[PDB]
Amino acid sequence: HSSGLVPRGSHMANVAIIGTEKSGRTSLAANLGKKGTSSDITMYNNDKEGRNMVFVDAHSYPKTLKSLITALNISDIAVLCIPPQGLDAHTGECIIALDLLGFKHGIIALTRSDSTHMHAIDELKAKLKVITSGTVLQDWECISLNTNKSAKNPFEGVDELKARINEVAEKIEAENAELNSLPARIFIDHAFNVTGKGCVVLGVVKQGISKDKDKTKIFPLDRDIEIRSIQSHDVDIDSAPAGTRVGMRLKNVQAKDIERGFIISDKEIVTTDYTLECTVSKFTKKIEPASVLHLFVGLQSEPVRVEKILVDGNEVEEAKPGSTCVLELSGNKKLAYSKQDRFLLANLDLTQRFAAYGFSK
């Protein structure tokens, strides 16, 4: 039994459209759905074509990492846009980020196809088979396409991209369904006041099934809240299973006290310090005590200091690129997380800024 006249269906996909400067990312996202919420990321909704699809354009990357990492941690499928001759520093940084995230499901869009030739595209596909070997991208399809209605081959490859997104989406729907039996968690990416509605948050159910009228909590505030209604693609629903992009009206909390990164759930860890078992990228600088990193967990991102580095429980003066270590980290702000949440560490002053992933010890 469910609300309304026709069940939602577990038909949905949340897709991140990412990549380097001048890669056709925004034009692709903009031609795949209707412009919705827009901050440092922009949602393009499309519930007109079978799935409730949300495409998130990380338009503030490469300027900021938060734009990219937010788009990624609310999405289940990544479309990495690489333009002709587009093997540059940011395409490399995106590949490294996806691989440090263990991001399973994606597609390479070889954009701007009308600006290039088959034989060049075949050479770039060959190249990418190399760069992505032994990474999570290794078996991602590369689809050549453009979004130029005036080209000789207008919108070639867009139908093929969409068909591959739907194939991957079907696999993710089964994976997310397995998570329905877990306790609900919802990650919030936006919060605002709505006249006559009060506190509304937008987010995605990460696991479990969130139900209308649930009495639960919000973290890191650690405050009791009630879910007054859940909306998906403009329609109120009684329940929202894992994977569902939601808008929720909340009782007992004010939008001004919520930030992107807050979590609705019955229990989360809240700390300002972290002890992480980390795997350091081969493509970063050795990590040293008392140095500065940026930490991302869920949809949160804050500066941290490395207090202590251990290898085999013994304290060391460095963690080399491409090594494993424990990092004791300290920070100012209280963050919420559970142990399943992958942490990413960055050095914002580098060229390739991603340093490591880790999990709470």
Is it true that the peptide bond before 220 is cis, omega within 30 degrees of 0? yes
113 is in an annotated binding site: no
- Give dist(CA 32, CA 50) in Å, integer: 13
278 closest CA partner among 339, 333, 360, 335: 360
CA distances from 261 to 135, 200, 258, 337 (A): 28, 15, 9, 9
- Give dist(CA 282, CA 92) in Å, integer: 13
284 is in an annotated binding site: no
330 is in an annotated binding site: no
CA 223, 229, 231, 237 dihedral sign is positive
281 is in an annotated binding site: no
Q: How far is CA 358 from the centre of its chain?
A: 16
324 is in an annotated binding site: no
70 is in an annotated binding site: no
Give, for 37, the enclosing helix (H) or strand (E). strand 34-38
114 is in an annotated binding site: yes
Residues 345, 357: contact at Cβ < 8 Å? yes
- Binding-site positions read 23-27, 114, 147
- Binding-site positions for GDP read 23-27, 114, 147
